Design a protein around this nucleic acid. Structure first.
Ligand code: ZN
Length: 54
DNA sequence: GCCGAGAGTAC
DNA sequence: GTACTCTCGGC
């Protein structure tokens, strides 16, 4: 239905207002270093809570 | 296989 | 006016 989020279209400016808002992030389980805090949550499901939630 | 980053929107 | 989430490609 809605178009997908493609970063291919022209006029793709890279403002720091998207990276500046996030601060470095470390994993308390395997000390993995994730830069974006949002990505840190994803790391939890990838190398830790990646098991069935049931 | 994981990682890193852009856009659209709400308050 | 900021940060939020969802997505896509790259090595
Ligand atoms: Zn970890």
């Amino acid at each position: 239905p809605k178009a997908k989020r493609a970063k291919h279209p022209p006029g793709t400016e890279k403002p720091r207002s998207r990276s500046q808002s996030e601060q470095p992030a470390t994993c308390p389980i395997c000390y993995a270093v994730i830069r974006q805090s949002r990505n840190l949550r994803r790391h939890l499901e990838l190398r830790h809570f990646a098991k069935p939630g049931v």
